[model samples]
Target chain A: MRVSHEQFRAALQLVVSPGDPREYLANFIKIGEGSTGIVCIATEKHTGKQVAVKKMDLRKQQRRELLFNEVVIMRDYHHDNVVDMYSSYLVGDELWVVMEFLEGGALTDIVTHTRMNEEQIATVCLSVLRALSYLHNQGVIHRDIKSDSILLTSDGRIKLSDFGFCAQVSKEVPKRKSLVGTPYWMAPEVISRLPYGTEVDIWSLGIMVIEMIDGEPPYFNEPPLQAMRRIRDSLPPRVKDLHKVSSVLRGFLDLMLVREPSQRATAQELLGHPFLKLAGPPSCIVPLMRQYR
Target chain B: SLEIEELARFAVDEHNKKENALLEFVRVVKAKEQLVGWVYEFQTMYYLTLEAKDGGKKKLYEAKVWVKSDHMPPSLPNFKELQEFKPV
Candidate 1:
C-alpha cells in the first residue's frame, strides 16, 4: 500500500500507463493534476483541437464526489465567462474528461507576472461579474471566486474555472453555512460568522481588485490566522494608491467590501456600475495576455 | 532515505528546463525531512541542500520536495509524483 518516493518514483515510471481509452484522443503530455485526476493537454483528433484532458481515476471515494460535483455543475451551466466541459467518458476506473484549452492559463499569471492599471483590472472584473451574475440568477453561488480560479484565453477572454464548491442559493441565511477557501479574499461577514450568500463573491472580487492594484492582496504577505484577525476587527483592506485611483473605482470597491453582507452589491448591480463602463474592448487585454509566461 | 541522489539529479534537470539554467547535478550537500501531516498520515516534506555545477561555477541551492508514503489514489493508477521542486 506504500512506497517511498525514491522507490515510488521508480515504480511509478516502471508501471505502464493506462493509455487513452478512446481512439479519438491522442498524444497527451502531462500538464497538471487535481486530487482525483491527472490533467493532460492532448489533441482531439476528431477536430484537431488542443484540448485539456483530465484522466480521473474512480477508486478514490472523496475526490470521486468532488469530480461528480464539478462535472455536474459545469455541465449544467455554460456561459462565455465560464469554462466549458466538452465531454466526459468513463472507461473502467479511469474517466476521461475533455475541456476547452486556455493557453493563457490561470489569472494569477497576470496578477503575478505583469503590471495592470485600473482600466485593465476593471476589464477582467467585468468578465467575472457577468459570470457571477449568470450563476447567481440560476440560484448558484460560486463559493470559490478569486483571481486564482479565473482563466484566460490567448486573445484576452476571461472565464471562471473550478465549480466543485458551488452551492445553491435561491434563498439564504442561517442555512448555507460552510467554510470555503483562504481568508485572503473572504468576506468580512464570513469571517465574523454572519449569515452570508452571493455577497461573498463580490467581497472576494473586491480583494482581487486590490490585489491587481497593489501587486498582491492586502494580507497576502501575511499568514492565515492573522489575516482573519485583521478582518474581524473591521480593518478595511484599502487599495494602496487611493489618491491615484479615480473616484468611480473607489466607490466600486467600497460597494463590494462593506462589512454587512446585505449592504453588498450583487453582480447584476455591479455590472451596471459606472466604474464597469470604464472597461475597454477585448482588444484592451491583448497586450496584457501576451505578457503571460 | 534513499532520495538524495535521484532528487538532486532531477532538481538540476528541472531547473535547466524551467529556468533555462545549464546546471549539472553535483551533490546533495544537506538533507532534512518534515512530516507536514497529522499523526498516522504519510505526507513528508524533503528539503535538500544541493550543489549544482554551472559549467564553470558550482553553487549550493535548496530543493524542496514533497514525499508521501502513500501513493496517489489510483489517479495515475497509484503512481507517485515527486512533489514539486522549487529552489529556495
Candidate 2:
C-alpha cells in the first residue's frame, strides 16, 4: 500500500512543525529539495523504522514509467556503495520513494571542508569505481555521477545515490531522447548528443576525481555551451598549478576524461589501474554516526 | 546444500557461453504480484564441468559464457540526434 495524502501531510508536520507523535502518522522531518522533488524524514508507524522519503510531483508529467523503472532497478541493485531503496508508493499525483537514511554526510560537505589528499581521494574514487563496476556489470550506466551525488557515512564510506538520469546501456541505441542532468558533470558525448556507452560515466568520474583533488571542478568559469564545446572539441585541460600532484595522477585523469568515448577507461579498468592499486587496499570503513540530538 | 563454488562455477559457465554479456535464467518456485523469493542470478561468468558426486570421474561441460566486450551490440550514444548532426 502507498502513503496516503493524509499520511504525507502528517509526516510533513514532524519537520516544519512540532507536534505529538500520533498513532497513525510518522514524525516528519524535511530533509532537502532537488530539481523536482523534496526528501523528508519518515518513520514507519508500525515498526518505527526511519526511512528517507523522496516525494516528487508528477502532476504535469507522464513519467510513471520512469518512476517504475527506477523502482525496479533500485530493488534489483544491491551494492555496499549504492543507496538501498526499500519500497516505493504512489498517492494521487505524487511518488514517494523510501530509501535508506545515510547518517554520515555528503561528499559535497567533505570536499567543501578540506580537499582530500591523494589517499583519501583514492579511497572515495575506489568506492565509486566499485559501485560503477557493479552497475556496468549489470549493463547499467549512471548518467549522473558527481560529488554532490556521492554520500559519505560518518566513518567515511561512500554511497552513490540519485539515479534520476540512469538508464540501461544496451548494445543498441536507445530510442528515448531527452536532454538531462547537470551540464557541468555531463560528458562531452552527452553534451554533443552523440552515441555514448558507459564511458560517459567514466568521463564524469574523471571530472569528479579532479574536483576531489583541487576542491573545484574543471571548467567552472566558462558558460555551459562554451565549456561543453571545448570538452567535445579537445581533451580535458591540465591542472599543473597544483604543486605536489604528479604526472602519473594526471595521466589517469586524462585517460578517464578523454573526449573520444571509445578511448576512455571503463569503471573496471579504473579500479584495476595501477594508480588506485598503489594507493592501498580497499575497505568499507564508514562508521554510522547519527546526528547529534 | 549446494556448494558456493559449484553455484559460482555454474554462473561463470553460463556467462562464458554468452561471451560475458549479461544473461539471466530464472526458475520461479512461486510468483505473486511480480515478486519471487527463490530467485537466482548468474552474475559472473565461469566455465562449467560435470563430475560425479563421488568427486572421482570428471566430465567437462565446455559451454561457458564469457563477457563479450568486443562483439556484443554497440550502444548508441544518442541515435535520435544522429540524423540531425549527420555531416551534410
Candidate 3:
C-alpha cells in the first residue's frame, strides 16, 4: 500500500516536533502552490533567516508513503545546486516543510522573459548537471526535472526543487511508471510507458536546452497529444538556429537527447562534456534575474 | 454560490478548449480556498472538485485555479490561471 499521509506525518513527527509553525516561522505570506501543498515565504524567528514553508495537507497529499524516506534523504543530501530542506513540522493535518527561499524564483520565470545566450544556458545546465550527478550517484531518480522545478537565488544561484517524484532506483521497480513529469518535457522512455531511471532527467534537460535557445521546446505550439507524440516519435527535434551553436554544444545535446535510455549520457558524463565549459560564472546570470526583480 | 458555479464552468470550458474534450459541468462538488491575497498584485487560489460528464461518462476532476483579481487603482482584466487539472 502507498504510505498514507497520516503515517508519513507520524514518521516525520518522530524526528521533528508537532506544533504551531506560525509561532516559530513568522510572516507566512503565500508565494506559490507546490505540487503537494501551499508554499509560502517566512522568516525563522531565532536566526531571522528567510525560508519557504510548504504546508501539505496530510489527508490528500498522495505519494506520501515514501515522503518520510524522501524527506529524510533530502535532509541529509546537501548540494549547492539542490534546494535544501531546513526542517519539517506537523501542524495537525498540515506538514510544514521549511526550505531555503530563492528570491529570484523559478528558472522558468526567467527563461520565459529574459533572453539567454548559449553561455547562459550552459551555466544553468552545469548547475543542474552537478545536482543530477550528486543525486544519481546514490541511485535516486528525480523523475520530474524541468525549468519550472528549478529555482534560483536573488544573486543567481540555481537549484532544483521538489522531491515528490524522486525515489531510489531500487524502489522504482515496485511501482507503476505509467507517466510522470510535465508533458512537454517528458522523455521518450517516460512517454513510451517503459521502465526508466535517471536518464529520463537528462532528456528533460535537453528539452530545456531547446527552450532556452529557441524560446520554446519542440511542438510547444501544438496540442498536448501532438507535442507528446512528437517527443515520442521524433528524432531529437532541432532548434531554429541550431547551425549557429557550436559543434561541441550539438555533441552535448546528441548525448542527452538520444531516444534510447541505455545510450543516453549520465549526468556525470555530461558534466565532463566540452560544451559545459562554455558556462559563465553565476554572476553572469545575476544581471538577468535582477532585471525581473 | 452562483459565482463558484460560474468559476467551475469557466474551469471546465478552459479544460475543454485546451484538451479538446467536450464535457458538460455537473456541479461544484467541493471547493477549498487555500490562499487569499493580491499576490498578483491580487490572486485567489481555489481547489475545486468539479463533477462533469462526457455523454454518460461522469467523472470528478480536481482543478486548482488561481484567479487573478484587479489591483488597487488598476485597470487590467481579471483572468483565471489554471494550475492543475486531473480526474479524481
Candidate 4:
C-alpha cells in the first residue's frame, strides 16, 4: 500500500503552508533537472541546515505516480548509506521533497574526472552493498542502480539517492517483470522482460563497479536500442583493464555479473567477498574528493 | 457578485506581495461546480482552490504549484484566450 497524503503530512516535523514555502525554506538555487523534475539547494530557515529539495510538478499522471511511489518507499527508510528525507510538502500541483544535501556530487562525476583504486572502489561497493542488504531485507527493490544515482558527501560518506523506480515486492511473489532502468545498466533478465528479483540490482551494481574502474559503462557511447540489444544478447561486459586490478576484485565482478539471476551473488553474500575485505576506511575517499575539488 | 476569477486575481496579488518575484494570475479551473485557480511565476505554476463556507465566504482548501515542462513554450496566451481548453 502507498503512503496517504495525511500520513505524509503527519510524518513531517515542519510543514510549510502553500504560497509561503519561503517562510521555512529559503535561498533556492537550481542544481539539476531531469525528466521527473528540478532539484534545488535550499536552507531550513529555523535550523540553518542545508537541504536538497526535489520539486516535481504532479499535474501529469505519470509524474504523480513516480513521486507518490518515492514518498511511500522513502518515508519508512532510515539508513546511513541512503539519502534521508527530512520532510515533504504537496503544494498546488507540486511536490517539494526535502532531503540531506550531498555536496560531493554524483559518483559519475568523480569517476569521470579521477581514477579510483581497488580499495576506494571496494569501499564504495561496501557501503552500497550494506544499503542493499538492508533494503532487500525490508522487501524493497531499487530498480535503478547506477553511478549517477550514487551520491557522495563532503566527508566521504556514500549514499544511494533517487528512488523513483523503486518497487516493493511480497515474500511469496518476489520477481518483477516490468521493463525499467537505464538500458546500459539493466540486467539480462530485465532486458528480456523476464520475471526477475532483486538480483537485477546486483547486476546493475556490477556495471557500476565497471564504471568506477573505467570512465563509463560498456555501452556508454552506443545508441539506446543498440545498447539494450548488446546487454541482452552479448556476453557480460568485463572491466577493460581486468589484469590491472586485483584478482579478488575481478572475482567479485564475476559473481555480481552472473548470467542467471539466481546464480548472481546477493548483496549480503557479496559483502563477504575478499575484494570488500581489502577496503580501506570510508574516510579514504575524503582525499579523493579534496583532490577533485 | 465576486466571481472566481476575481478571487484568483486577489490570491495572486497576495502571493506576489509575500514572494520576492512577481506572479501572474492564470485562470480558474472548474471542478464539481467549485473553482480552482492557477498562477505563473518563472517556470513554476501555482494552483489555488477554495472551499466555500457559511454566508458565501470562501477559505483556501488547497494551493499547489509545479514547473512547466522543458518543451513547453515559456510564454503563451492567457488561459481564457485558448479555445476548447480543459485542465487535466
Candidate 5:
C-alpha cells in the first residue's frame, strides 16, 4: 500500500514546522522519490556536511518498518560502495533517514553521457560485483538491481543504492511472491514468480553487462510486459547484432543469463573471468597471480 | 598566520583527499619563500626551505617521509564507493 504524495506532504507538516530554519529547509532542495515517498537533501547542523534525507510516508505500517530496517542494516555494516546511513528520526507520522550524499549521481546518468569502453566498464562492473558479493555474503538480496540503483562517483567508483526491496535469506526459505525489479533485468525465475535468491541479481548483472557493452539495456524499445515475458521464456536479446561487443564478453553474458539458475556463474566466478583479466595492462596479471611462478 | 599544529591537522585532512600529502607542504614552503626556503637533495623526498629576510638563504629544516597505504587515514563516503562496491 503506497502512500499518496498529498497525504505524505500533509503528514510531513506535522513534523516539519513552517518557516523553521535548520541545516536544510524542508521544502527546498528536495530530490526525487518513488511512488510512496520523497527524498530531500539536507545539511547536518553539527558538522555542516551534506546528507540525503529519505522521508517515507507511514500510511502502510510495514513500509515504515522496512525503512527502519534499511537504516539499521546500513549503520551496522561498513563498505566502500554501500551508502552510509548516518541516523534516523521519527517525528509524528513522518520518518527520516539521513545518508551520505553522493555527488556524481546514478549510473543511468553516466551511461547517457558516454558508452563505457570495455576496460572502463569492466572496472565499474568489478566494483558493482564486489559490492553485491558483500551484500549476498551478509545474507541480503537486493531484489531491485538496475542501472538506476547503481551510482557513480567523480573518481569512477560505483555504489549500489535503493535497498528498499532487499530481503534476508532464511534457512526455511520464506514464501517469495512479489514480482520485483525492472523488467529488463529480471531473471527467468523472477519473471515467472518462482522462488529465487541472489542468482536473480546475477541475471540483473548480465543485463547490466549487456547494457554496458551495447550502450542500451536489453529489450530497451520493447513493451515491458512483453520484455519480461521473453525473459521468463529464457529468451535473451540478440547480442551478435551488437557490433561493438566482444565474443568472450558475450559468452560470459550468455552464461549468466541461462534459464537454469544453478548453471549461472556465481559472483566470485564471474569476478575471476578472463575478460576482465585480459582487458587490463600486462603487468596487472602479475599481481592477479593468474600464473604461478 | 597558521600555527604548526594547525598546519599538521590541515596536512592530514588534505592527505585524506588528494593522497598526496607532501605536494601541498612543498607548495606552502615555496609560497613562504621570503620567510623560509629549503632544497631537496633527492627527488623522492621533501625539505623545508629557510630564507633569511635580508637576502640570505640556507637549509633550515629538512624532513623525509615515505608514504604507504597504511599511513593514510580513512576517507569519507563519495560517489565512487556508493555505485561501484557491488558485492556478489
Candidate 6:
C-alpha cells in the first residue's frame, strides 16, 4: 500500500521525540556515497528492521527534478524485484529517503570479481527481465539499466535500484527521445537522438548480459563520448568468445542487441525465450553470491 | 542592534508563513564585508544574508533567506499515475 506523507510523519512522531529532526536519524551509520548524496544503513528503533537511508544534500544538487521523479516513481511501484521505498523526510537542507535494505550489494561487485557460468547469468537475467516486464507494463522506462543499477540481497534475491533517469509515459504515447544512460550500455537509437521506447532498456539488458559473461560491457576502456560514437557508428558489439556458451543464450543476446529499436525484443517477449527456460531456480544465484563473498 | 533584530524577525515571520514552521533566530555576525544572519534548524544553524539600505542604518532592506529548493514540502505523485501493466 502507498503510505501518504502525513501518515509517515505521524508514524515517525511516535518513534522519535519531536525536537531536532536530525535526532530521528541519529543511529544511522554511513554506508556509501551515491551520485547526489550519501547512503546510510539504519535500523528502525521500534520494529528493529534494517533500512537503507539515502541522504541527499539538496543544496549541492543541480538536477532537482530527477530526485522528485525518483520519489514519485518509487512510491508507486510495488514489486518483488524492485526496491521498496518506506518513507522520506526533508529537514533543513538535507533529504533523507528510507528504503528496504539489500545486504548483498550490487551485481557490478559480483560480476567484477567472479566470472559466472551461463546458468548463473540466466538466473540474473530472469530476475531483471521480470522487473522490466513489470515496469514496462506500468508505462515506465528505467532509462538507466546496468550491472551497477542491479542489486542483490544476501540470499540472492534481485532488486533493481537507481531510478534517477526513469521516465513515466502514457500507454497511448509510449515513446521517449532523451539521450540518457551510461554510454557503454546505451542503445544505438538513444545515442543517435531518434525516438525510441521501452526497447532501449532491452539493449542495455543485452549489454548487461555481456557484462555478466565477459566481466565488463563493450567499450569499457573508451571514454564515454567516444564509446557512444562507436555504438552509433560501429557494428553492434558481439559477445566475445561466443563458442563458450550455448546457442540459445547467444541467440537471446542477438535478439536483445538488434540495432533498430523496433527490431529489439520486449521484456515480456524475452521472459519466454528458450534460454531462460534453462535457468535454475531463482535461488541458484545464492551459491554464486557465496563464491564471491 | 535594533535594526538587525527587526530584520531577523521580519525574515523569520516571512519564512514561517510560507513553511508553516516556527524558525528561531540565533545571532548576526560580520563576515568579509557583509552581515551574516543565523537561525536555528531545530538545534543546527541555518544561515541567511540580507541587502542593507540607507548606509547600514534606517529601515533595513529585504532579508533574503537561503532555503534549499528540495527542503520545501513535496507534492504527491508529481506526475500522472499509470495503470499497472500486465502481460498476456
State interface RMSD in Å for all models. 11.5, 17.4, 16.1, 17.4, 28.8, 17.4
Query: Which window of ten consecutive residues has the lowest lDDT sum in model 4 chain A?
Result: A11-20
List of chain B TM-scores, one per candidate: 0.67, 0.23, 0.80, 0.34, 0.23, 0.33
Runs of candidate 1 with Cα error greater than 4 angstroms are A1-21, A34-37, A56-64, A91-96, A171-175, A192-195, A290-293, B1-88
The fraction of correct interface contacts reproduced by each prediction comes to: 0.00, 0.00, 0.00, 0.00, 0.00, 0.00
Fraction of native Cα-Cα interface contacts (under 8 Å, chains A and B) also present in model 6? 0.00
List the candidate 6 regions with Cα displacement exceeding 4 Å. A1-25, A171-173, A290-293, B1-88
Model 4 sits at an interface RMSD, in angstroms, of 17.4
Cα-lDDT of candidate 1: 0.70
Docking class of 3: incorrect
Model 2, C-alpha of A124: deviation from truth (Å): 0.5
Pairs of residues clashing in candidate 1: none
Error of 4 at A194 (Å): 1.4
Q: Specify the CAPRI tier of model 6.
A: incorrect
lDDT of 2 at A159: 89
Relative to the unseen true structure, what is the C-alpha lDDT of residue A251 in candidate 3, on a scale of 0 to 100?
Answer: 89
What does candidate 1 score on TM?
Answer: 0.67
Candidate 2 — which residues are off by over 4 angstroms? Answer: A1-25, A60-65, A171-177, A240-242, A278-293, B1-88
Docking class of 4: incorrect
**Which stretches of candidate 4 lie above 4 Å from their native place?**
A1-21, A60-63, A290-293, B1-88
What CAPRI-style quality would you assign to candidate 5?
Answer: incorrect
Judged by DockQ cut-offs, is candidate 2 incorrect, acceptable, medium or high?
Answer: incorrect
Clashing pairs in 6: A137-B85
Best candidate (score: TM-score): 3
Residue by residue across A1-293, what tens digits does model 6's lDDT show? 56555554454444322344345444778988966899888767667777888877755655443556666666668799998877767655566777888988889987888888788888889889999999999888998899999988987888888876788888677687665677688888776667788899999999999999899999888655457667888888987787887899999999999898888899999999989886777577776674555
Model 2: how far residue B20 lies from native, Å:
67
User: Which scores higher on TM-score, 1 or 3?
Assistant: 3
lDDT per residue for candidate 3 within A1-293, as digits (tens), equals 57665566667788665577788788789977755778889988999988888887777644455446456666678899988887777788777788888888777777778778778889999999999999988777777787788888877888998876676665536333535567788888776666777888899989888877777777888755557668877788887876778788888888988998889999998998889888998888887784644
